[PDB]
Amino acid sequence: MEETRELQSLAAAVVPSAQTLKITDFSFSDFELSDLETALCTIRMFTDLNLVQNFQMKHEVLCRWILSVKKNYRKNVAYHNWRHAFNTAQCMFAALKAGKIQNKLTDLEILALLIAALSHDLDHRGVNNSYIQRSIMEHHHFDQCLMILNSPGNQILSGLSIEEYKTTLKIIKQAILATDLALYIKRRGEFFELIRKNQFNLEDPHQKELFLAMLMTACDLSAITKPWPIQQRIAELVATEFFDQGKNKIPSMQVGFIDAICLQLYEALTHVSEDCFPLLDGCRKNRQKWQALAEQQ
Numbered sequence: 285m286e287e288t289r290e291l292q293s294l295a296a297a298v299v300p301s302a303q304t305l306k307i308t309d310f311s312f313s314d315f316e317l318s319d320l321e322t323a324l325c326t327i328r329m330f331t332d333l334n335l336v337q338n339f340q341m342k343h344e345v346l347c348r349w350i351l352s353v354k355k356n357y358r359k360n361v362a363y364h365n366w367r368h369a370f371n372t373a374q375c376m377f378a379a380l381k382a383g384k385i386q387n388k389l390t391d392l393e394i395l396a397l398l399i400a401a402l403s404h405d406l407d408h409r410g411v412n413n414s415y416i417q418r419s420i421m422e423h424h425h426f427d428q429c430l431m432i433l434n435s436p437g438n439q440i441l442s443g444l445s446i447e448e449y450k451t452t453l454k455i456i457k458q459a460i461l462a463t464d465l466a467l468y469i470k471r472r473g474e475f476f477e478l479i480r481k482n483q484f485n486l487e488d489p490h491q492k493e494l495f496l497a498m499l500m501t502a503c504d505l506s507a508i509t510k511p512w513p514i515q516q517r518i519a520e521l522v523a524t525e526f527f528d529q530g531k532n533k534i535p536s537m538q539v540g541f542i543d544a545i546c547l548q549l550y551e552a553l554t555h556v557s558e559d560c561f562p563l564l565d566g567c568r569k570n571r572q573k574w575q576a577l578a579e580q581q
């Protein structure tokens with residue numbers, strides 16, 4: 285099988301440093317990377333967050349798990365595919381390291397966030413696809429996540445005690461549920477209102493959970509923070525999924541997306557951690573770019 289070959293190659297490969305793979309950079313891009321290379325980057329993410337160590341992950345199991353996750357995204361979907369999931373996780377890794385968020389979280393929270401980031405859009409069929417089995421989409425994504433986590437040879441949480449496991453699974457679930465933008469809109473007010481008054485405190489369980497939710501959305505949307513040539517390309521992908529699947533209004537829509545959803549979030553995040561500023565800076569630069577295009581109609 286192509287996949288048995290794929291596992292062997294992945295399992296046998298040496299994993300380059302985080303620095304070599306550029307995964308610490310907020311401006312990271314995956315366009316030039318093969319599927320195998322994104323798999324290596326993902327291993328390095330688990331490794332340098334001390335997750336392989338602290339939770340006793342077997343190499344071939346983590347490899348198998350990454351390949352299962354990748355396989356359960358749909359290639360024919362223009363934007364919501366493995367590369368979007370991979371990028372979300374990279375942004376999580378970057379925010380944890382470069383953004384210095386790692387120190388504010390527990391190991392179990394970090395484990396959950398990385399798994400959630402990678403898993404949060406599993407089996408997405410594209411924005412214009414919706415079926416009736418009756419945050420519905422997000423429950424399906426989590427279901428896929430759980431299914432892969434319980435599959436033979438893919439159990440990367442096997443090293444956790446049952447108590448750690450249940451705690452981790454619940455964090456993973458809330459984190460994936462949080463990627464529902466309706467949910468983010470409903471909850472962000474509290475977050476912003478809290479930051480506004482310097483009342484925001486991570487030691488409070490309820491606020492911790494709120495922050496994990498906000499962090500998920502920030503990574504999820506982080507293409508909007510990329511260098512202009514990259515953002516332009518990603519916008520092209522989402523435009524294809526939005527309209528093609530299955531006056532140019534796009535620049536105006538992007539400005540509206542940035543204003544309504546993106547700016548305040550990245551603003552809020554930089555307050556929590558000044559080192560996350562490149563996300564806010566990048567988002568502001570893209571607004572300027574899209575706005576100018578919008579002004580030319």
Ligand SMILES: CCCOc1ccc(S(=O)(=O)N2CCN(C)CC2)cc1-c1nc(CC)cc(=O)[nH]1
Binds near residue numbers: 540
């Ligand atoms: C680039 C072509 C247009 O893209 C958009 C148009 C409108 C809006 S929106 O804020 O008004 N709105 C629409 C209804 N919802 C689903 C919630 C959001 C968002 C985007 C957009 N989304 C993403 C994330 C998938 C990335 C991105 O770059 N742009």
Ligand SMILES: [Mg+2]
Binds near residue numbers: 405463
């Ligand atoms: Mg989603």
Ligand SMILES: [Zn+2]
Binds near residue numbers: 368372404405463504
């Ligand atoms: Zn997403």
